[PDB]
RNA sequence: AGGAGUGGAGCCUGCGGCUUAAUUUGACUCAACACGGGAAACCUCACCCGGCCCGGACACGGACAGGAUUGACAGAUUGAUAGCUCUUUCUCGAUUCCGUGGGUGGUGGUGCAUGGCCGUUCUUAGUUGGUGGAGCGAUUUGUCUGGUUAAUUCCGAUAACGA
RNA sequence: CAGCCACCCGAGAUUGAGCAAUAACAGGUCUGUGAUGCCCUUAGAUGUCCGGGGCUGCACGCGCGCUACACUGACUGGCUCAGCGUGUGCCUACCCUACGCCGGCAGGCGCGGGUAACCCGUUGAACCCCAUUCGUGAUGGGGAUCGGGGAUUGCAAUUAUUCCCCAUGAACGAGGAAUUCCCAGUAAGUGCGGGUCAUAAGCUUGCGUUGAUUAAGUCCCUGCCCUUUGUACACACCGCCCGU
């Protein structure tokens, strides 16, 4: 799907920071609630997560109206190589606090 | 019920095909033997379109393609 | 502002229903039994009851640490108000949901319908239930659908005691040629404590105590102490 | 893995096309021959 | 035995027909017909007329920073301020675009392939083992001559006992 | 004996619903579902938006209903009594209304309360009651169909959304063959809430108020259960089967 590169950067940064993603399955929602002040439509998030799922990077669940996505190890490696993050950075999920 | 086809309309509405232009950067500047550069295309007065965003030299108007600003 | 009590209770019920549905879909494989939400002004605790907690927790606690994240993402209440705990069920044989899931996953593995149903029935009866019923409906063999019924022990159908003496579970399983339906009913035994059964007895069961032995009096005796 | 149950096969297909087969299977389960 | 009625009138609403470009469709004795919670100006919408969009993931091949592609002012055009198309040039920077597979989305077809739910037989009083008795056997008794009850409810009789 | 009838005492000597077995139906639902198996279609789409129409179109038949055919009535005043419930909403825009002023009315302006035994609200409901006018005349019964104006909801009211005012004033004088429901606070009369709802009840689901005639039986009609009995039926009388 066609979208500006900064939207993809923001979505991937949020996904790697948190480790999980939630969406409402609303292609007409003007902007994702979590991605505020960055002007990312919900449709872009849905399609980006679908593209990630097709490659095995994220695991998907659907509940009552919502998409839930969890990050896989190969997805972690792909995001780390994509965002040029140092090997000392891990998502908040992988930290047993 | 089964879907009927009924496939008959205007023969084919064609999609717009964008023109392929080779080295469109060159025609924006003119060069003298001394090495001077003169900008043939006007520069938009907008904020973002200030230095490298040139306008369009239409036969009766000037048009910036990045912000739709139009001048006579 | 604030909402009225009617809307508040309806919203709490809807939230619990959606949470239970999500947990079911997520943890069916782990023998998910139920969810219990205890609301405290400090934090809202969620207890997840399942047959095995090792898969729910995950390695080093990753998977559960994911769930308490997405829940916080879904319903939107602030961080630090979420904390999930996994507790194993006291007896897995007396839970209709766990047995329905076990039967569903035995069928999904290719086991014979009759053998799996009889194994589940035997396990339920050995657990200590008064009785059990298992019904499997669908295209078991051929283009024509049918239903197999396996019953054992006692079973009540009508009245109010059905509410607290019978545990019911309905499940669907997708096989290569379509959907099969599973229904499981378990009749709980009477337990004076509320651990593994109803505290109150059946309405029509009357227990008359045996009288104690009494010494026949013969001569008037006066005892002073 | 437990794949086939002769008892269920006979009890279901005793009146179907495959009766004469399943009966023949059931005896093999019973008499050991 | 009666009361209020309906069937007659006007009107409101569903179902057939007949018209229509379309007058979307399910259901037809109880157990279809102010029923689908179906009181539709738009949406709903599934029907008809006309016009945009891809929201065609992913893999392989081609093309590509000497530019893959994106959007758009004016005039024409259009129901339309859909750059939808035509003239004109501008803008965008690898996100896409062309082929092969392979997916997705459907109020599309099958309820005579299914699950679940609901309705009906029937809310009537019915149903079934275990040991015993009778038959080579299928099968039968228990579950009955009779009184009683809303009731296989009970009392009684009793090769049946308890359930 | 099981139990039945009557009576005393007594608030009550049968309150009304919910749940409801074994077995089945080719009963309804794929148009409730991100329940679902197979087919069909997928860029000139059966996907999805936008604009305009249709679902309501009228020589005719069939159901569920509302209003009536009047005097045990209609109209105009006066007086006086309820209950069940709802109310400011994640997306989500849309709540219930007291009081003051303007208008003849539908309505319009202000300014307050209520997230509710707190405010609307002592929910001044309608039938009913007391007076006035009319007087067996399709009549001051009935209110269909139409004309001209005004106002609210909406982005949009024409094929009239709804509401208000003048005017117009149809059939209908109790209904053939046939047919439905009902045994006490019941049937019927009369209003009021909830659902649908931007606009909104002739439907449904509940609630009160006024309040009866008849019956305490039967198997005649209809239907469903048992027992005995006959069968060449077992896809079970919508069967099987004979002869031209
Ligand atoms: Mg019982
Ligand atoms: Mg009962
Ligand atoms: Mg009437
Ligand atoms: Mg009549
Ligand atoms: Mg009539
Ligand atoms: Mg009809
Ligand atoms: Mg249709
Ligand atoms: Mg009936
Ligand atoms: Mg209809
Ligand atoms: Mg309407
Ligand atoms: Mg219109
Ligand atoms: Mg439109
Ligand atoms: Mg329409
Ligand atoms: Mg594209
Ligand atoms: Mg469609
Ligand atoms: Mg669908
Ligand atoms: Mg069916
Ligand atoms: Mg079915
Ligand atoms: Mg059923
Ligand atoms: Mg016996
Ligand atoms: Mg015997
Ligand atoms: Mg014998
Ligand atoms: Mg018998
Ligand atoms: Mg009897
Ligand atoms: Mg059928
Ligand atoms: Mg269904
Ligand atoms: Mg479907
Ligand atoms: Mg289907
Ligand atoms: Mg429908
Ligand atoms: Mg349009
Ligand atoms: Mg439309
Ligand atoms: Mg209609
Ligand atoms: Mg009806
Ligand atoms: Mg009527
Ligand atoms: Mg009515
Ligand atoms: Mg009067
Ligand atoms: Mg009058
Ligand atoms: Mg008067
Ligand atoms: Mg009066
Ligand atoms: Mg007159
Ligand atoms: Mg008159
Ligand atoms: Mg007018
Ligand atoms: Mg029309
Ligand atoms: Mg008038
Ligand atoms: Mg009402
Ligand atoms: Mg209303
Ligand atoms: Mg209706
Ligand atoms: Mg009779
Ligand atoms: Mg004879
Ligand atoms: Mg016989
Ligand atoms: Zn500019």
How far does the centroid of ligand 29 lie from the alpha carbon of residue C1, in Å?
A: 40
Whether residue C124 contacts residue C93, with contact meaning beta carbons closer than 8 Å, is answered with yes
The neighbouring-strand residues paired with A61 are A68
Contact between chains at C70 and A96 (C-beta distance less than 8 A):
no
CA distance C122 to chain A (A): 34
- What is the signed CA dihedral for A73, A78, A82, A85, rounded to 10 degrees? 30
> Is residue C153 within a helix (H) or strand (E), and if so which, with residue range?
strand C146-153
Read off φ and ψ for residue B70, nearest 5 degrees. -130, 135
For strands C178-187 and C166-175, give the pairing.
antiparallel
C-alpha to C-alpha distance for C97 and C23, rounded to whole angstroms:
13
C-alpha to C-alpha distance for C51 and C30, rounded to whole angstroms:
7
C-alpha to C-alpha distance for A4 and C42, rounded to whole angstroms:
42
B46 token code pair? 């907008």
C-alpha to C-alpha distance for C20 and C14, rounded to whole angstroms:
10
Whether residue C158 contacts residue C180, with contact meaning beta carbons closer than 8 Å, is answered with no
Whether residue C18 contacts residue A63, with contact meaning beta carbons closer than 8 Å, is answered with yes
C-alpha to C-alpha distance for C133 and C185, rounded to whole angstroms:
5
C190 token code pair? 């009477």
From first CA to last CA, the distance across chain C in angstroms is 75
The neighbouring-strand residues paired with C87 are C49
| Among the listed residues C45, C83, C50, the one whose alpha carbon sits nearest the alpha carbon of residue C64 | C83
A4 token code pair? 């500006």
Say if residue B8 carries a ligand binding annotation: no
Alpha helices (H) in chain C, listed in sequence order: 5-27, 54-57, 62-75, 96-108, 113-127, 161-165
C-alpha to C-alpha distance for B37 and B43, rounded to whole angstroms:
15
For strands B37-39 and A66-71, give the pairing.
unpaired
Strand locations in B1-68, DSSP E?
29-31, 37-39, 56-58, 61-63
Which method resolved this structure? cryo-EM
**C114 at interface of D, judged by CB pairs closer than 8 A:** yes
Contact between chains at A64 and C69 (C-beta distance less than 8 A):
no
**Resolution reached, in Å?**
2.8
Read off φ and ψ for residue B12, nearest 5 degrees. -155, 120
**Residues 17-36 of chain C whose Cβ lies under 8 A from any Cβ of chain A:** 18, 21-22, 25-26
| Among the listed residues C106, C179, C184, C117, the one whose alpha carbon sits nearest the alpha carbon of residue C145 | C179
**Long-range Cβ contacts of C76-84 (<8 Å, 24+ apart):** C77/C44, C80/C43, C81/C43, C81/C44, C82/C43, C82/C44, C82/C46, C83/C43, C83/C44, C83/C45, C83/C46, C84/C46, C84/C47, C84/C48
- Within 8 A of D5 by CB-CB distance, chain C residues are 112, 114-115
- What is the domain extent for residue A32? 1-97
C-alpha to C-alpha distance for C91 and C195, rounded to whole angstroms:
10
Secondary structure class of A88 (helix, strand, coil): coil
Contact between chains at C69 and A34 (C-beta distance less than 8 A):
no
Q: Which CATH architecture has domain C5-88?
A: 2-Layer Sandwich (3.30)
Residue nearest to nucleotide E56 (CA to C1'): A1
Whether residue A25 contacts residue A53, with contact meaning beta carbons closer than 8 Å, is answered with no
What residues contact C52, with CB distance under 8 A and at least 6 apart?
C30, C31, C88
Whole-angstrom CA distances from C144 to A13, B7, B30, B48, C140 are: 53, 40, 84, 71, 8
CATH topology of domain B1-72: N-terminal domain of TfIIb (6.20.50)
What residues contact C123, with CB distance under 8 A and at least 6 apart?
C93, C99
Size of chain C, expressed as the number of residues it contains? 225
Contact between chains at D2 and C111 (C-beta distance less than 8 A):
yes
| Number of domains composing chain A | 1
- Please name the nucleotide lying closest to A3, CA to C1': E95
Residue nearest to nucleotide E113 (CA to C1'): C143
C-alpha to C-alpha distance for C126 and C186, rounded to whole angstroms:
12
């Amino acid at each position: 799907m066609l979208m500006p590169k900064k939207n993809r950067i923001a979505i991937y940064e949020l996904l790697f920071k948190e480790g999980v993603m939630v969406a409402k399955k609303d292609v007409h929602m003007p902007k994702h609630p979590e991605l505020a002040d960055k002007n990312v439509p919900n449709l872009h998030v849905m399609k980006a997560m679908q593209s990630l799922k097709s490659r095995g990077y994220v695991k998907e669940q659907f509940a009552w109206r919502h998409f839930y996505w969890y990050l896989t190890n190969e997805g972690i490696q792909y995001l780390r190589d994509y965002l040029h993050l140092p090997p000392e950075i891990v998502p908040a999920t992988l930290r047993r606090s | 019920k089964k879907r009927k086809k009924k496939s008959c309309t205007t023969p084919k509405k064609n999609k717009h095909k964008r023109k392929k232009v080779k080295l469109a950067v060159l025609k924006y500047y003119k060069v003298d033997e001394n090495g001077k550069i003169s900008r043939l295309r006007r520069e938009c007065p907008s904020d973002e379109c200030g230095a490298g965003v040139f306008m369009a030299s239409h036969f009766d108007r000037h048009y910036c393609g990045k912000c739709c600003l139009t001048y006579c | 502002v604030q909402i009225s009590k009617k809307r508040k209770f309806v919203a709490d019920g809807i939230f619990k229903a959606e949470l239970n549905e999500f947990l079911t879909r997520e943890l069916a494989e782990d023998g998910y039994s139920g969810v219990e939400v205890r609301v405290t002004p400090t934090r809202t605790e969620i207890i997840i009851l399942a047959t095995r907690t090792q898969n729910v927790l995950g390695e080093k606690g990753r998977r559960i640490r994911e769930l308490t994240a997405v829940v916080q993402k879904r319903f939107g209440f602030p961080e630090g108000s979420v904390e999930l705990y996994a507790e194993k069920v006291a007896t897995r044989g007396l839970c209709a949901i766990a047995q329905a899931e076990s039967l569903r996953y035995k069928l999904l593995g290719g086991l014979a319908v009759r053998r799996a149903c009889y194994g589940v029935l035997r396990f339920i009866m050995e657990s200590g239930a008064k009785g059990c019923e298992v019904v499997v409906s669908g295209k078991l063999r051929g283009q024509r659908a049918k239903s197999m019924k396996f019953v054992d022990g006692l079973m009540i159908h009508s009245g109010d005691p059905v509410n607290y003496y019978v545990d019911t579970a309905v499940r669907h399983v997708l096989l290569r040629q379509g959907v099969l339906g599973i229904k499981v009913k378990i009749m709980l035994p009477w337990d004076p404590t509320g651990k593994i059964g109803p505290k109150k007895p059946l309405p029509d069961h009357v227990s008359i105590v045996e009288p104690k032995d009494e010494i026949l009096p013969t001569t008037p005796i006066s005892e002073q102490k | 893995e437990l794949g086939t149950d002769p008892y269920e096969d006979f009890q279901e297909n005793w009146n179907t096309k495959h009766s004469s087969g399943v009966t023949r299977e059931l005896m093999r389960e019973l008499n050991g021959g």
